[PDB]
Structure formats: C-alpha cells, structure tokens
Design a binder for this molecule. Sequence first.
Ligand SMILES: O=C(O)/C=C/c1ccc(O)c(O)c1
Ligand SMILES: O=C(O)/C=C/c1ccc(O)c(O)c1
Ligand SMILES: O=C(O)/C=C/c1ccc(O)c(O)c1
Lengths: 514, 514, 513
Amino acid sequence: PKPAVELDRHIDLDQAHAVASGGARIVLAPPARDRCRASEARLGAVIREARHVYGLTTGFGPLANRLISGENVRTLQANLVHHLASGVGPVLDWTTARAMVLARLVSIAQGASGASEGTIARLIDLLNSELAPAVPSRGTVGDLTPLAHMVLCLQGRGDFLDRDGTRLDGAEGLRRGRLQPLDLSHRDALALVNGTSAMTGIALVNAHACRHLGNWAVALTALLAECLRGRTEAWAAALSDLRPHPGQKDAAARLRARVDGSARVVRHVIAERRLDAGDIGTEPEAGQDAYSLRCAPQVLGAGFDTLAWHDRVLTIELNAVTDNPVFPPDGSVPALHGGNFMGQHVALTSDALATAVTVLAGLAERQIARLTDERLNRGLPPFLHRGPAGLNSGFMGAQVTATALLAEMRATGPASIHSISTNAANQDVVSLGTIAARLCREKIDRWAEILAILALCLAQAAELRCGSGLDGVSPAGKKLVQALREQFPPLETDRPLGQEIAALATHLLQQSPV
Amino acid sequence: PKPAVELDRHIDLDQAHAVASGGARIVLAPPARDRCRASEARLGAVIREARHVYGLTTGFGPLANRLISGENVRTLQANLVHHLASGVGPVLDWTTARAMVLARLVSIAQGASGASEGTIARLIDLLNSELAPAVPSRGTVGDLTPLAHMVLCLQGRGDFLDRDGTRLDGAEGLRRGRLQPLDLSHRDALALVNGTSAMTGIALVNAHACRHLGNWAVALTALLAECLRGRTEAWAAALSDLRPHPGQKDAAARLRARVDGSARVVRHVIAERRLDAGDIGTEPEAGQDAYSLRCAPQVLGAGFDTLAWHDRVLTIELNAVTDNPVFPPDGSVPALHGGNFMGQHVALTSDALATAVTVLAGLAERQIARLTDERLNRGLPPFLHRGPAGLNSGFMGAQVTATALLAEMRATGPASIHSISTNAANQDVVSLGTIAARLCREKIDRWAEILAILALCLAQAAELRCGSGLDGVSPAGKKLVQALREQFPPLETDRPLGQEIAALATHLLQQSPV
Amino acid sequence: KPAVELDRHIDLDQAHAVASGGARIVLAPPARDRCRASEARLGAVIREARHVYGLTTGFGPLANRLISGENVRTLQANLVHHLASGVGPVLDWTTARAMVLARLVSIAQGASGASEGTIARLIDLLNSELAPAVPSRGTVGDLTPLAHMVLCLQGRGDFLDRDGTRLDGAEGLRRGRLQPLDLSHRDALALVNGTSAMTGIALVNAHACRHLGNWAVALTALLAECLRGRTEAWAAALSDLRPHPGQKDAAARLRARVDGSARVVRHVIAERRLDAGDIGTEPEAGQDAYSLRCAPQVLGAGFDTLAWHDRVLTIELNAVTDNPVFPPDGSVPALHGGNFMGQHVALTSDALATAVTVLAGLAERQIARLTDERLNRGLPPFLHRGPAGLNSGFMGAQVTATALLAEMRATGPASIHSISTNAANQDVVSLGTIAARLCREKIDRWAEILAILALCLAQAAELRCGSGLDGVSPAGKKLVQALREQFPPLETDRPLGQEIAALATHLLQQSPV
Ligand SMILES: O=C(O)/C=C/c1ccc(O)c(O)c1
Ligand SMILES: O=C(O)/C=C/c1ccc(O)c(O)c1
Ligand SMILES: O=C(O)/C=C/c1ccc(O)c(O)c1
C-alpha cells in the first residue's frame, strides 16, 4: 500500500519529504485534531467579542490603522488574497509546492492559528492527492504572495500541477483530485496566508536533495581513488579523531566503507617504510595525493556540518508556528501580535548551505578536471576516450561543461544581504528567505549535473583502468558502475552526452548509490 | 511584404534583431557570395596541399598534437560535433537561438571561414523560416557546445522550436520549415562550430530589449513627475551642458519631451523668486524633489552610456570573424591560428550592462516605493487603492513584489571574474561570455517586470490625481495611459495582478511607449 | 593577572583572554608530559629514518624528492624561507597572538613532536606584551603567516607592541625577554602547519560579535524607549511558538533591557474590544515596523549563526590541524593526510559574515527610522538641537551609516573562489583565512554603524524624556549616562567622525552592563 505519516506535534525532515513527494499519505492525530478544534473556537470568540486583531478588524500592513467593521470581514479577507496574488515567474515544482502546503499545515497543527476543520481538511486532501497547486516562484520578500496563490488554487481559481508538471485548470484539479473548494467563511484566511511556508518548503526539498548528492559525492570520491591508485591513509579514523568535526569523521568513515574490499587503492602507511642511503633520490610520485583526494574528508565534512546546521534550524522552523497574529492555547490573552513570520533563519541557513554546495561542486569539478587530464590521471587516455585518439575526444566536451556549470554557480551569492525597506517603510527589514532557498536550489541542481558528469567519467575510467570486468574494484564500486551501465552505455566512440548528463542528474537528486 | 536585409559585410544591431525575430528576411549580397565562394576554394586548396591546419589535419584541444590523415577527416569532424554536444539546461528562446545562427553567418560572410555554399544556404534557410534550432543554454565557457547542438539540429538530429517555443523533432523541423539536411562533406564543420556566436546572439537580443526598456524608464519617470507635481528645472538642458555626458544629455532631453504640454508638472525655477522677511520659516515642501525624480537624468544617463559602450563593442563583435583557424582572403598564408574565439569583450560588456540594468531597476523600484507611500505621494491614496481603504489595499502586494524582484537581481554578480583553468589546463583562462550575457538577460527580464508594475501604478495614479479624463496630463502621458487601459482595466477593487504584470512585461521588452 | 592553564581544552573566552593579554598562559603538567612523549616519538621517527613529509622529503609536489638526514636542517630552514612571501597590512596585535595561541593549543594535544624549547618560545610570546608582525595576505588556507611568525621568533622579523608600534627583531627579543627560536630538533613542521591564522582571526571575530550583539540588543531596546515601541512583540509566548534558541534569547534579553521602563507600550492590543463608533482611521497602527517588531527574529537568526560558528571554531581551536602527525598510541610512526584544510573556518566565517551584514542592516534601518521626522513620532528631524535648518544634527552621520552598510554588502563569501594551485597539487583550497578576514572587516563596519546608532539614541532619549531621562528604564539610563561620560550631547552641529570611530572601538571590546 502506502506509508502513513500521523501528524501530531513533531514531524522530521524525512517524513516531511515523504509526504511532499507523495511517498506517504498524511493523517492528523486525534490530539492535534482536538487542539485545532479548540483553537477554532478561540477564533470564533475573538471575532464575536470584536477584539482588536490584525486581519479580523483591521486593514493590512500600514493600513492596519484602518479599523474594519465585523460586517465587512468576508470582503476584507477576500481582498487580502486578491491584492497578494501578484506573483510572477516559473511555478514551484510539484514536490516543492506541496512542501509549502505541508509547512503551513504543520504550523496550523500546533493549534494556535484558529483554522477551521474544513480548512485543515482541504490542505490534508491536497497532500493526499496526486496534485500540487501551481504557484509562481517570485514575489515574496519572505511568504504571503505564494500562499495567496495557493489559496486561489484550492478555491478552484488557480491552476494545479500533476507529478509531471502539466497544468490543470482549477475546476479540473478539484475534480480529478476529489478536492472540495476551499471555504473561508469562518474568517480563518490568515491561517492560510501567513508564516514562512514557501521558503520552508523549498528548503526541506533542498535538504533531501543534498543528502542524496552528498552520498554521491562520497561514492564518486571513493571510486576516483580506485581509478587513480589513491592513498587510503589520508582517510584514516585516527586523523578524524585528531580534528573531531562530526561531519569530517562521518565523511572519512563513509569513504573508507566505500573502498572496503578494493585492491585498486594504496593502503600502505608511508611512514612505516624505513629509508636507507640507496633510497635518497627522486621517486616517480609523491607520497601523498593531491587535495581533491587527500582532503576529501575535510572538504566534504565541512559541507556536511553546514547541512547539519541547516537541518537543525529547519526542523525547528518546520514544526513552529510562524503565524501572525496567533491565538495562545492557554487562553492567557485573546491573541498576540508579533513577527514570527520573519524568515531570517531559513534565509541565513539557505545562504550558508548555498556556499557549501558551491564548494562541494567545485571539488567534484576539480575531480573531473584531474581524472580527464592525461598528465595527471596516471596513465589513463586523454579525456578517457576510446577509439583512435584525435579522431575521438571522449569526455573533452563534458569536462568543460562541468567547469561552465560551476562558474555559473559562483556568479550568484547570498540573498540575505539585500534587504530593502519596502511596504511604505513598514517592512523596513525583510529576510528574503524564499529567494535564498530558491538560489540554493539552483546551485543544488548544478551540483547534481556536475556529479553526473563525474559519475559517467568514473564509469568509463574504471573500465579503462581495470577492464570491463572491473578487476580489483571494490564491491561497492562494482555495484555503482554496474548500476550506471544498466542505463548508460560505455563511450566506445564519441557521442552527444547532454541528454544522458541531464537524465543522470535527475536520478542523483532522488536516489543514493547503494 | 516582409522586409529584406541584404548582408554584405556590415549589419547593425537593429537589422540583426529584425532578422533574428523574423521581422525581416536575409539575403547574401553578390559580393559576399563571391567572397565566400573564394574562401570555400581556399579551404579546398589547404586540404589538397595537406597544410598543417587545426581540425583538418589535427585533433582538437590538447589533442591537436595528434596529426590526422586526410582519409579520416570526415570522421574527425563528425566526432567533433559529437563530443561537444554535452549541453544542458533550458533551451535558448526562439529569437536568441536564431540570433546565434545569424552571428555565425555574419562571421562567415566576411569570407575567411571556408564555409561551402550549401552550409551557408542551410543557415540562410533557417533564418528565413519560422523555426529556430533547440539548443541547451548551458555548457560553454565562452561557444562550441551550443553551436554543436545547432549543427545536429540542422542535420535533423536535434529538435527545433516554433515561435511559441513548442518543440518539434528533427524530422518535423526539416519538413515544416522546408529545410535541407546539413551536409558537411566539404569538411567545413569548423565554420559552424566556432567563435562567439551564442554570447553575441544573446547580447544582441539584450541590446534590443534594453533600448525599449530604457524608453519605458524615461516615459514612466516623466509620468511620475506628472503624478507628483515634479519640478522640471532639474531636467533643464543647461544642467546637461554643465556635465556633458551624452547619455545624461539624452536622458534629460527625452524627459523634457515626455512632459511637454503638461500642466501637472512645476516649471518655475525656484531661484527666480525673491524672498522677503515674512517668508522665513518652514514651507510645506522643499524646493527640490527626491532623487528618484531630480537625479533621473544622471542615473538614467549613466545606464544609457553603459548601453552605448556595450553596443559599440557588440557591433564590432557581430561583424567580426571570431573563428579559429581562419583563411586569409588576401592569400598571404594558407591559414592563421590564434584565439579570436575568446569572448572577453562580450563578457565584460555584458557584466557592465547587467550592473547598469540593476541600478536602473533600482531607480524604478524606488519610484514605485515613493508613489505608493501615502506619506510621500503628496495626497494620493495609500498604495493607490480605490474603494474603501483597508478593505482594499490596491498595489500593496505588487509594490513588495517589485522589491523582491530587485533583491533577487542584486544577488547575482558579474560572470567574468570566475574564470577557471579547464580542458587539461589548455584553456587556462576562459571568458564565460555566454554566461555573462545570459545573467544580464535574466536581469533585463526582472527589470521589465518592475517597470510593468510601475506602469500599472502610474496609470492608476494618473487617473486618481487628474481624473479619468487625465486633465492637465501631457499628450505623451495621455497616450501611454490610454494605450495601457486598452488592455489593462483600472483597479477599482483589489484583484490578482500577477498575470497582468507578466503580460505587460512581455510587451515592454518588445515595444516602446509611442 | 589571571592565568589560563592549558591542558587539552580551552574555551573561546579563555583563548581571547590570553590573546588580548588579559591573562597569562601556563601549560599544565599533563600537557607538558604528552608533549615530551611526542618529542621522543619524533626523535625515534628520525632515528629510524621513517619516510615522513618534511623530515625525509621536499615540500608540496617536491615531496617526491627524498632527503638525506644530514640535510634536514637546511631543508626546514628553506621551508620557512620560501614560505615567507606574505604581503599586506600586518595582522593586529591581538589577532597575531591569537594565531600563536592556536598553534600552541594544537601542539599541546601531543601529536606534533614539538620540543620543549619550541613550546616555551610560544608560551613566552603569549606572556609578553608583544606579538609577531605578520603580513595578512598570502595564504590559501596557513603556512605563509606562520613562516613569518617563525622568522619573527628567531629575531629575523618585526614585532608589534600593544599599540601596534613596530620593533625590529633584535629589539623585540630584548624588550619581550624572548629567546631566539631554535629548530635544531627538526620540529619546524610543528610551527608551520595547520589552520592557526584563520582560527586566531576567527576567535577574535567571535569575541567581537558577542559584544556587538549585546549592543545590538541594548540599542534596539533603547530605540523602543525612544519610539514608544510595543513590548508584546517581544513576549516569551511568541518565542515558545517558534523555539529558535537565538530568538528566545534575543527576546528575553530585549524584555530585560526595557524592564522598569515607562516609555514603552505594554498593552496587548487584542485585549481591546471595538465598538461601531471606533471604526475609521486611527492615528497609529497597532503594531510597530519590523526594525522593532521583528528584532527577536532578525537578531535571533544572527545569534544562532554565531552559535554554530562558535561550536565549529571551538572544535577547530582544540584540534590538531597538523600534517604530518605522530599518533600518541604508537600505532603507526606517522600519519599523512589533510587536517590543514581549513574548510570549516571558511564556511562558518562566510556564514557569520552574512549574518553580520544582516544585523548591521537592521541597525542601519533603525537609525534611518529614528532620524526621520516623518517616522520618529514627534522627534526633531535628524535629532538636531538649536534652530532647525541652521542645524542638521545627525543628518550626515545617518548617511555615513548607510555608506558603511552599502560597502559591507559589496563583499561576498570567500570560500567559493577556490582555484587549483601549487602545480595542481592543491587543486582545491579553503581560503578560510581570507574568509575570516573579510568577516572581521564587516564586524568593524557593524561596530561603526552601532556607534552611530548609540550616539543618535543618547540624543533621542534626552529629546524625548528630557536630560533626566524620565520614564527610561534603569538599563537604558545607565547606558546613556555611561555614553555621556565621554560623549557630550549634540546641542549644536559639530564633527562626529572622530567620536564615531572612538565609540566603535569601545563597542568591540565591552558590552552595556
Ligand atoms: O506589517 C504587517 O504585519 C503586514 C505587512 C504586509 C505587507 C504587504 C502586504 O501585501 C500585506 O498583506 C501585509
Ligand atoms: O585550444 C583549442 O583551440 C581547443 C579547445 C577545445 C576545448 C574543448 C573541446 O571539447 C574542443 O573541441 C576544443
Ligand atoms: O601537499 C602538501 O601537503 C604541501 C603543499 C605545499 C604547497 C606550497 C608550499 O609552499 C608548501 O610548503 C607546501
């Protein structure tokens, strides 16, 4: 059948991605259902008592000094969704749009948003269906605009996306997915258009993609060592203990596991060799590898620790209530007004992860540059070609393409530093967290393509070095090459690789080498 | 009666865009045809005489040290196209892809590439058709990869694009476009896979778009002055004469022309007034406007001078021969080997223009921020809303979207500074000109969206200030607003504006306010 | 003077105390014992002629050239020589000493082989009032700066006194009572190794950020007191709903700063029940602009970034970033790897630099709002005193703060610019030293922006509450009174440049307590 995620209070990143990707169905746990019903009642009382509350009896933004009569709240909230639907640009992908819906739901599930049962059910239904709202990716300074577009979609006034990205009009979406048109008669529109749902959704997808890409980075580094007689002593556990960064220790351990059983790597500790007068001279190779191999644990590890911080912060954000206003469950006050919608946390972690992805992609790019260079690849054909040299150039074009992709990644920097006072100076500081997460996603995609080129190069290199039978190659290495060869043939003669590179990259983002 | 551009030696940017956009047919002038026939013969002689020439008797890149026998040249060039087809990413748009084809053609037309009559005809046939080759946008370090994909397309081994971007397979493209499959039997493949055609094509489309956007920036700045009682003395010719930057003189002159006939702007020179004792005190307003109006000539002018430099450089590049190797028309030597394919000129000018676009976009974004602020817009409704305040927020969402678009533009910097040694260190410095032109294009697209928002706001602001009849508004101002109102209705009540912003943005990139 | 006893672990505060001269440093007996054991191991490695980088080989790609024992002295002497190609302004006194300390902490772990004399030279330097004069540029991440340090310690390079005044090598040894570094034990690699420079720069950045963060909070609080800010936005309940440690902390510290204040608005707006007669446009909105309302969230994110930076830095500082290294357990004679790759400090420094720029932006916008007569709720334009027009107050300083911020934004992460070098042997490099230095520059700019904001707030408080600061919280009163001891009110326009600079220097080393 299909796995089910029962949402109560806390949901981890894997569960969140399982639901967003459609791998698991979602259900609201009884305790959560009750907390929400209790919050739904508080909203009702707040409205009945005509309490001074943003979005219920006031205008929006700087227009909040304009009080609104209870009789016009329906109109007030309908125009909120209207004026906010100014988004532009390509729509968020299926998984990501759904991750945004999930993020809003999790916040509501905490029981402080006043959302009604019907509203909550509409979000759950979307998540359990095979559809996603079609929402523009640009427009928010960090996430009212993308959420306003979501609302319109759930009302059948906006397009939907199927798993392939093909758009369906509103009516067709509600029909096909058996979704009921969203009804905001309870005046709970602020429960849907609030918080940091978009950036959080984008980031949770980023987190999942990076885990898979990190696994490929490790597996490809290990296979590179098997193709270049790499020295395993640089990956010794003893070295990790001397500089105990968790991410490094993990990188090293994982690299060691990948090459376990290999007869292609050099396992001797050079310091065990005692020299005598006859040894003094110039040896063919230095006793240590170039940094793209020797410092893989340190470079990969730094990135892993950056992703770890990103996930710790993100886990907290995903399970938090980033709504404004909020209705305290204890009933201490009718409502609280603050700024928990300021996505500075996801903005800063996304920018930090973006830099780490660029650094790791640079490592993969240099690993390709080294492997394909006849002066540095220790005996392998130039650019790993097959057939007569000259008449065949092998991966010479693919190698340059990897460099081109990396160069483009570097041209874009952090989004967080570009805060600009807007909204008539009311939002004098903004997080730009959604932009930050989106820029990180683009880099993650470029990293996947660079890793794809490296994987194809390594499949070929392994065969050129060890024969089609991959003699001496580790069990893990053999399994990885064999799996690749199931869909990607050896390069016996030059052929267009662009489509294969793009196809493999898509795979790397969703599955790890095991 | 579809216009025709006759190509001899030189073609200006407007003519180039006329052909690339399909607004004009292209024909090779008699003298050009002869120069090419003569070059074709020279290539034949080089082959006949077994001259040592890159691509005719040698491998590619660092593999050029491998000499090739004449009987293997067909295979040599076939694999060249193959190994280079490693491109990925979204395909270049219809117009840009065709601009690339044109750029290669113009270089060949100089008579130093050795291209055969058939090869040249395939390029001309493509440009006179309604099709464009479908080529990936990423993969070059600056443009063999995108041009190799072009070659495959013209052979019927790659997709094609119709004006709407819908993709057709190779066969369908040759059929629908009534095109002959490309035949490289004359061994003239290097006449197609060479130079800076991609970046040049992208840049020439950028140049055309910026001309139109610049006209909108000027027109909207002028309309803004009519909506805020702007002072025209800051735009006086005398000021331009004191600081003679051509771009500034032009900007000031165009601004004055836009408000000619306006009774909504203040034309009195403040220094003409003589003050008495009873004047000393605090006046309602300062004698000078904020910079977004007062310094428009200086800011817009600097952008215009930047575009001017960009266009002078691009014009030379478009009409140059960026091939390698080349066959001197004067017959001095059989062929010359150098690096005219290094696109550093387009790289640096594209980066400089991108900065200028971001600056001018910032100007527009601040003009929007001021116009919609009730504390700064001198009596206009907050966010230019209509209907009851609070219940309606007008362009409050669109204003923030403008800020978000600008912030994103700022996150990406120059592409040129990221050169990385590649191709086994043979290409130890690369231009990244294609990437630079592409990053500039994205910024131009964001600028158009920001201007679109400003245009919609100004249409509303003009009617709010001067009534639906636009009383006192200049003739130019009236024409612009009326033209907009033909497709974009007033905002009498809040509605989603995303689709309208996008639609208007597309228009602003192709037409100026006239 | 307090003493920091170094055994295995030292925290960031203890490190800065020693680096800044506030505390002496002593090597604990257990550490001296572990180091003596490591010195013996290096001796055995040399006697056994084990194949070890720097002891029997050239350097970098030249490591394939094996070296005879009789030539090792020359070998290591030239290592220091070729590496001394650094250029640019010297690291400041505190930072340079922080670098010396970082190398020592690594050596103290007992895996570097450093001789007792070499260790003593580092300890002596730290206990003296001197710092080696080392150029700030030249490393791709830290052999070059460390090589310069070695030359200084041998009396072949300049020293800096606390004031930054330079002394030649000979004078430095004499004035500091330092003995010339002797590398006869062939332990040169114990000094020219690791991530000492970027780590030293980073720990100084860490200390400065703690102080500036305290000012950022204190000034945000005083801003609320000058603009009738609403405290409900800083309620603990909100923190609990979005439990980011840094945010909860920021909100709690903000509440504490305004405790006892009669100038802030404490009412919870949702308590008010509206009547039909109230419907219309009120003078002010029920919530503050983001520079006040979202301070917990913006400051908080910045604090969590610093917390991550400090966690990673603490590990780096206390680790052995040496290569080669000599296993204390004696499992193998030596290990060859890449623990010198400073990617951790590179990524955290870059991440912190972004956070600093974000928080400086907040401070800059707070100044922009406070000095705007249309937004400061009744305060004079640019907080001027004396006749308006004839006086412009902080109008110039306000623009200066914007210029300082705009400059900060022009510089991005250093880590993304790795370039293959050293004949492609170092095909990837961290650039951590550069990253840490770039972050330091942004920290200095942030200090100046905060200084301008503090001077504006002292003036604004007096204009709003009178010289007696009536209704101002005890913390706010103490802060203004402290500032006023050295910085006079602005009763008439005057040059503020030197005062801004002077105050900024203070903010970096002390918090408002
Ligand atoms: O300060 C706030 O709490 C609201 C800000 C805001 C800013 C722009 C919008 O379009 C909007 O609905 C709300
Ligand atoms: O140095 C040159 O002139 C050739 C460069 C080059 C670099 C990569 C390729 O795939 C290729 O066909 C050519
Ligand atoms: O690979 C290594 O472990 C050493 C690299 C290196 C690179 C440049 C220098 O000047 C030097 O002393 C050492």
